[PDB]
Amino acid sequence: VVTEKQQMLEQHLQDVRKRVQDLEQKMKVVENLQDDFDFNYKTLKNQSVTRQKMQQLEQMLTALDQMRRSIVSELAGLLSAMEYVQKTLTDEELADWKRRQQIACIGGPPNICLDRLENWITSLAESQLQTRQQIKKLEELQQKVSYKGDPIVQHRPMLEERIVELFRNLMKSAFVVERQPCMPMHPDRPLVIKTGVQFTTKVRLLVKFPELNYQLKIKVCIDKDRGSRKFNILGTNTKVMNMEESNNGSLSAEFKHLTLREQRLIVTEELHLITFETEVYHQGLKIDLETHSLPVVVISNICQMPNAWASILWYNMLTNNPKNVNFFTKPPIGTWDQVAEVLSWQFSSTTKRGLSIEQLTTLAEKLLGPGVNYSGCQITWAKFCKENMAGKGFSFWVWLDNIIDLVKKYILALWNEGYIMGFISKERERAILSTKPPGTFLLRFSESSKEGGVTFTWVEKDISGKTQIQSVEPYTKQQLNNMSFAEIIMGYKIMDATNILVSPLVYLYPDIPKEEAFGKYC
Numbered sequence: 001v002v003t004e005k006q007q008m009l010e011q012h013l014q015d016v017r018k019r020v021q022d023l024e025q026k027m028k029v030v031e032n033l034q035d036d037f038d039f040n041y042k043t044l045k046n047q048s049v050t051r052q053k054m055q056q057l058e059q060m061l062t063a064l065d066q067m068r069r070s071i072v073s074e075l076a077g078l079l080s081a082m083e084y085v086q087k088t089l090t091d092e093e094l095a096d097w098k099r100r101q102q103i104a105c106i107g108g109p110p111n112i113c114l115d116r117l118e119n120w121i122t123s124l125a126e127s128q129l130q131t132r133q134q135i136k137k138l139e140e141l142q143q144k145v146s147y148k149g150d151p152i153v154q155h156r157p158m159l160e161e162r163i164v165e166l167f168r169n170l171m172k173s174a175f176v177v178e179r180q181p182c183m184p185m186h187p188d189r190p191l192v193i194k195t196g197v198q199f200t201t202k203v204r205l206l207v208k209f210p211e212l213n214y215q216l217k218i219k220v221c222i223d224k225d226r227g228s229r230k231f232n233i234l235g236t237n238t239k240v241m242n243m244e245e246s247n248n249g250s251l252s253a254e255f256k257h258l259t260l261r262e263q264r265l266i267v268t269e270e271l272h273l274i275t276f277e278t279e280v281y282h283q284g285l286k287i288d289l290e291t292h293s294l295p296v297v298v299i300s301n302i303c304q305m306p307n308a309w310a311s312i313l314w315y316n317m318l319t320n321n322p323k324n325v326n327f328f329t330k331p332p333i334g335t336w337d338q339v340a341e342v343l344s345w346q347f348s349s350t351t352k353r354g355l356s357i358e359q360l361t362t363l364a365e366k367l368l369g370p371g372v373n374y375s376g377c378q379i380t381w382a383k384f385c386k387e388n389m390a391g392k393g394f395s396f397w398v399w400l401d402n403i404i405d406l407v408k409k410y411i412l413a414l415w416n417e418g419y420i421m422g423f424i425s426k427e428r429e430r431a432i433l434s435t436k437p438p439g440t441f442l443l444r445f446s447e448s449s450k451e452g453g454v455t456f457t458w459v460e461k462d463i464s465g466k467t468q469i470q471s472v473e474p475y476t477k478q479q480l481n482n483m484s485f486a487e488i489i490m491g492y493k494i495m496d497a498t499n500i501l502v503s504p505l506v507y508l509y510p511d512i513p514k515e516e517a518f519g520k521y522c
């Protein structure tokens with residue numbers, strides 16, 4: 001959906017193109033008038049007819065001055081308009097995409113499409129090129145014909161400085177990281193790179209100039225410019241930028257043959273920047289392009305992956321700054337609503353279902369204790385990942401990451417259909433089951449299991465009539481590799497008072513008969 005701010009920008013660029021094209025027509029007229037004055041001056045050098053020719057030359061030069069004064073001020077007004085539209089395009093519209101990329105990297109909505117920004121940047125770049133050529137023409141014209149108080153002599157140096165500054169800054173802004181450094185075997189976990197593992201990245205120049213095809217050599221490196229680990233990028237660290245049919249004519253450079261090796265604070269919290277460099281030589285201008293990736297965590301073993309991903313989650317959730325390498329020296333605090341958004345993204349990016357309101361509320365209570373409104377609550381790096389949970393030998397994130405993995409690899413189909421209540425407190429599960437008939441059950445995750453465990457809580461009535469709520473010992477990942485959770489639910493039997501094996505499970509919460517819900521999976 002196109003915004004009001006974006007539609008106003010589309011018209012502002014079209015108005016710039018119209019102004020640029022109007023000045024081109026004025027440039028033609030001023031050149032023809034000067035060419036006529038130059039010709040008539042150099043020629044014809046009854047004797048009072050020479051006095052009439054002199055009056056014609058004076059009138060032509062005064063008309064030349066007025067046309068020059070007009071063009072100069074028309075160009076000054078065009079540059080001011082270009083400056084405003086560029087600030088909206090680069091400092092606002094481009095920055096939003098950069099933030100949208102940070103969010104998409106975590107597991108947020110993938111709205112990071114460059115096609116609209118490439119079209120806007122190219123349009124502004126083509127208009128600025130014609131303007132730079134018009135200012136070059138004024139220099140050419142002045143050399144041939146000039147006079148005391150010439151508007152070109154006094155205002156062209158400023159006009160030239162302004163367009164050159166505009167074009168350089170637009171070229172520098174257009175050099176972006178389209179696809180952040182990521183390991184192909186871990187696509188859902190970018191910005192985490194293990195040493196010795198082949199990794200890919202992609203860069204794009206949003207100024208769609210066919211002149212630049214096969215002309216830009218992109219150099220990639222790591223740790224350019226206390227006691228921090230230094231690394232080197234090995235493999236093919238130079239790529240020539242080219243226009244592809246696959247990119248739809250876009251200038252890009254994809255690096256697929258990269259690896260990190262240590263050169264000759266905690267590892268999961270140490271951040272590094274992967275830098276891209278090139279030089280553009282366009283019609284007399286040397287523009288030095290330099291862009292960098294979002295901070296990367298460099299790991300040595302794949303066991304470090306969970307804690308490394310949490311550092312990326314914290315960074316991209318809390319800051320919009322793309323180069324804060326010292327972020328974890330004093331990490332910022334997050335709100336519950338900020339954290340809850342990220343936690344639901346961990347599930348919606350890997351599965352067809354994110355986290356529900358009830359699941360997020362029980363997750364809020366696990367970290368902050370009892371309450372009703374968690375919107376005014378705060379979660380620190382220590383409560384999330386750095387330190388172990390209260391009364392437990394593992395952190396909240398490690399416990400949660402093992403659940404995400406359990407869902408993704410062992411109980412995906414059940415999670416995707418909504419048969420997993422997942423996160424429900426001991427008090428709340430007893431409450432919602434108390435009303436329901438005997439044999440009603442819900443599926444949830446273990447809180448004491450570090451590696452991840454799945455359980456089912458059911459309700460029944462004793463001889464006395466008192467309602468009893470019990471859970472089964474959590475089924476481990478090893479057990480889920482032999483039998484599916486669905487087969488375990490159906491096959492579960494208990495020893496009755498009559499000493500007969502019976503299934504204590506009849507309806508899945510709220511009233512779904514077990515065979516209707518789990519029969520299709522066994």
Ligand SMILES: CC(=O)N1CC[C@H]2CC[C@@H](C(=O)N[C@@H](CCC(N)=O)C(=O)NC(c3ccccc3)c3ccccc3)N2C(=O)[C@@H](NC(=O)c2cc3cc(C(F)(F)P(=O)(O)O)ccc3[nH]2)C1
Nearest residue numbers: 445446447448449455470471472473474475476493494495
């Ligand atoms: C007390 C009661 O009414 N129960 C019935 C009896 C007991 C004793 C046997 C056990 C049971 O049913 N075991 C399962 C296997 C479970 C597993 N994880 O592998 C079972 O099917 N047992 C069979 C059997 C038969 C042959 C060989 C092996 C096992 C069985 C069937 C019939 C009779 C006896 C045994 N069976 C049970 O799990 C009973 N419950 C528990 O022991 C238990 C529940 C629980 C919940 C959590 C948590 F919620 F997730 P958290 O957030 O981490 O705190 C943590 C630890 C927990 N322990 C349920």
